[PDB]
């Protein structure tokens, strides 16, 4: 099965460089050219360049030269792209995929995981989690809605659940959003009147790169 | 560059729906058209090769066809595994280009939201801050738009919005808003709404809370 592994470096601050690694495996590694793509969040996919590792080498999409430089290592068989002078711009998820002839032209027909880029100015920082009670005027009156607020954290990701993962039915987690240089999200499950507050509801958020654990119970009033 | 346009950028088609995705690109690509697959939580899979009709082994419901600057994928009938972005690419010239992406979704029945608020959590408040939160829940269509007001006037500043993915058993959106206010502004006002548009209602649907009623 051919594979293509990939990992370099993800969070780098802006004037950095990075070289990622494209490990690949399940075929002649000389045999094919490897190609690099940028996907920038807001969806498109661009093309970076080419580096075939037996048949001579190199090409560049004219955009990246120069602040893109792809090698590769033959005996290890491993593809590098190391990117220059790092920007706002160049926060992305960067695939390497394999050519393959086709009578006439070439298929990327295997791709990486793709590597995660973050250029950023944060540094490691656990969340805030704070319980989300309904309010004032008694609400959610059927089924009750509770929530958690994860607020000020960096790196991605974090994990949410609740009562351990017992209570997975009903429960909504947001994607986290960036806001200034920190994430934040969001959870909310909606639960029978008759389980709280009779029942303790506690939203369980980890954050493994600051080594935290924190355990809200969802109470009454604010 | 040769640009590769797609048509349309979203498609909501109903499972079981024979579904055709176009591209075009700016000159005659020879027929070097490869299409690929983007999952959620973005694996990219080649589905189909040289100018849409050679299959890589992904399902036989997925076939291409096209000549010159007009290529189609068509899904003949749609499964749930295939809502997806599906990607073509001309491999005619350098640079590789891609086209601009189709997302796909499942159409469905209208629903409408369930909204709920929530005040500040004492915690935040020791810390100074106050967010106030908006969940509205489980609706179709994606599109709504949400608004806040204090006492009387402005959703505008402090406000983050985030939207789940489609569901994948019922088949609607969830979305948060939040807004953020520093304790002692927050102390300065009465009510706090959330105020939702959903063309599934004329009447927004509103949520608020005063501040001591609590």
């Known amino acids: 099965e051919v594979q293509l592994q990939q990992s370099g470096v993800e969070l780098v601050r802006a004037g950095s460089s990075v070289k990622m690694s494209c490990k690949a495996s399940?075929?002649?590694?000389?045999?094919?050219?490897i190609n690099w793509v940028k996907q920038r969040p807001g969806q498109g996919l661009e093309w970076i360049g080419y580096?075939?590792?037996?048949?001579?080498?190199?090409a560049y999409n004219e955009k990246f030269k120069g602040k893109t430089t792809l090698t590769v290592d033959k005996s290890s068989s491993t593809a590098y792209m190391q990117l220059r002078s790092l920007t706002s711009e160049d926060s992305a998820v960067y695939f390497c995929?394999?050519?393959?002839?086709?009578?006439?032209?070439?298929?990327?027909?295997?791709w990486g995981q793709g590597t995660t880029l973050t250029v950023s100015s944060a540094k490691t920082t656990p969340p805030s989690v704070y319980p989300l009670a309904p309010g004032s005027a008694a609400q959610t009156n059927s089924m009750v809605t509770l929530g958690c607020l994860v607020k000020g954290y960096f790196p991605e990701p974090v994990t949410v659940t609740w009562n351990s993962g017992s209570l997975s039915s009903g429960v909504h987690t947001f994607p986290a959003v960036l806001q200034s240089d920190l994430y934040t999200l969001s959870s909310s499950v909606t639960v029978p009147s008759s389980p709280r507050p009779s029942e303790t509801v506690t939203c369980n958020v980890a954050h493994p790169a600051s080594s935290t654990k924190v355990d809200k119970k969802i109470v009454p009033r604010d | 560059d040769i640009q590769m346009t797609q048509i349309p950028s979203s498609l909501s088609a109903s499972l079981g729906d024979r579904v055709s995705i176009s591209c075009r690109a700016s000159?005659?690509?020879?027929?070097?058209l490869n299409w690929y697959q983007q999952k959620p939580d973005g694996t990219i899979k080649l589905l189909i090769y040289?100018?849409?009709r050679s299959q890589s082994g992904v399902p036989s419901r997925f076939s291409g066809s096209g000549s010159g600057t007009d290529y189609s994928l068509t899904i003949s009938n749609l499964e749930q595994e295939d809502i997806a972005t599906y990607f073509c690419?001309?491999?005619?010239?350098?640079?590789?280009?891609f086209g601009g992406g189709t997302k796909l979704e499942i159409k469905r029945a209208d629903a409408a939201p369930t909204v709920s608020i929530f005040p500040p959590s004492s915690e935040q408040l020791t810390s100074g801050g106050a967010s106030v939160v908006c969940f509205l829940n489980n609706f179709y269509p994606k599109d709504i738009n949400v608004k806040w007001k204090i006492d009387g006037s402005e959703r505008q500043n402090g406000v983050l919005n985030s939207w789940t993915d489609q569901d994948s058993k019922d088949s609607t959106y969830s979305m948060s808003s939040t807004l953020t206010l520093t304790k002692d502004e927050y102390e300065r006002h009465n009510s706090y709404t959330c105020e939702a548009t959903h063309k599934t209602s004329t009447s927004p649907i509103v949520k608020s809370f005063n501040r001591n009623e609590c």
């Open positions: 995929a394999r050519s393959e002839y086709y009578g006439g032209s070439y298929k990327f027909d295997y």
């Open positions: 399940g075929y002649t590694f000389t045999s094919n050219g």
């Open positions: 580096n075939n590792p037996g048949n001579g080498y190199i």
């Open positions: 000159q005659d690509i020879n027929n070097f």
């Open positions: 040289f100018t849409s």
């Open positions: 690419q001309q491999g005619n010239a350098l640079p590789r280009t």
